[PDB]
Structures are given as C-alpha cells and as structure tokens.
Amino acid sequence: MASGMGVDENCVARFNELKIRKTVKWIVFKIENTKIVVEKDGKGNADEFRGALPANDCRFGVYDCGNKIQFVLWCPDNAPVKPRMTYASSKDALLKKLDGATAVALEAHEMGDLAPLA
C-alpha cells in the first residue's frame, strides 16, 4: 500500500483493453492491499465510467486518448485515508505499468467530476 506495489496480470488487461479497441474501453483498475486488479472493462464510455465509479471508494480508469492515457480518480468521502494514501505511493506502479500515461492525470473528489460525464 506504498511503493513497490503488486503488478498483477490485470494491470495489463487495462492497457490491452484500450489498445485492442483504441476507441474507448473505459477500464477501471482498483489497486488492493499490495496488488493490482481490474473491476470494469468492456467498452462503455464516460456513460458507464460516471455511473460505475463508486463514491465510497477511489478508482482509476484508463482511456486511449490517441497519444497519451489520461487517467483520473476521485477521492472517497467515506474514507480517503485509505486510497488517498495508498493510491498516493501506489500511483507509481500504475503510472509505470500504463503506456505513455503522462502526468496529465487528475485527482479530485467532487460530484461535478462525473456531472458532465464527457
């Protein structure tokens, strides 16, 4: 839950999901206690990404932007101390696993984040 995360085979499923479609696979990967896994995957667009991302917990999603992979996550108001902390020192692993995932990512907790849903 801090540095040297656990890169699981799922960590790749995300990249292989947006790469195979290159259109929009909206893959939501959730990092567990010293491990990585995927929760969502199978096309859906912001429509599902905005109606799937739980507000009780934090979750990041990848989306082939053509050049880079801008993935943003919202901090849960139920207990951010968990994710806000883990995802903090864990972002490295993910940022490393991804392909071309620049620092354009965003991390903010607000209802307006899923309001426009793109």
Q: What is the CATH number of the domain that holds 37?
A: 3.40.20.10
Q: With breaks defined as C to next N over 2.5 Å, after which residues does the chain break? A: none
Euclidean distance between CA atoms 102 and 116, whole angstroms: 23
Q: Is 86 helix (H, G, I), strand (E, B) or coil?
A: helix
Phi then psi for residue 37, to 5 deg, are -155, 165
Question: By residue range, what is the domain housing residue 73?
Answer: 1-118
Q: How was this structure determined?
A: NMR
Residue 13 CA: distances (Å) to CA of 65, 80, 107 = 17, 26, 22
Residues 44, 57: Cα–Cα separation, whole Å: 20
Q: Cα angle vertex 66, ends 113, 26, to 5°?
A: 45
> What one-letter code names the amino acid at 79?
A
Q: Enter the tokens of residue 14.
A: 């995300």
Sign of CA dihedral 37, 11, 51, 32: positive
Nearest alpha-carbon partner for 98 in 1, 27, 21, 4: 27
Cα–Cα distances in angstroms (integers) from residue 112 to residues 21, 84, 88, 118, in the given order = 28, 19, 22, 11
Total domains in the fold of the chain: 1
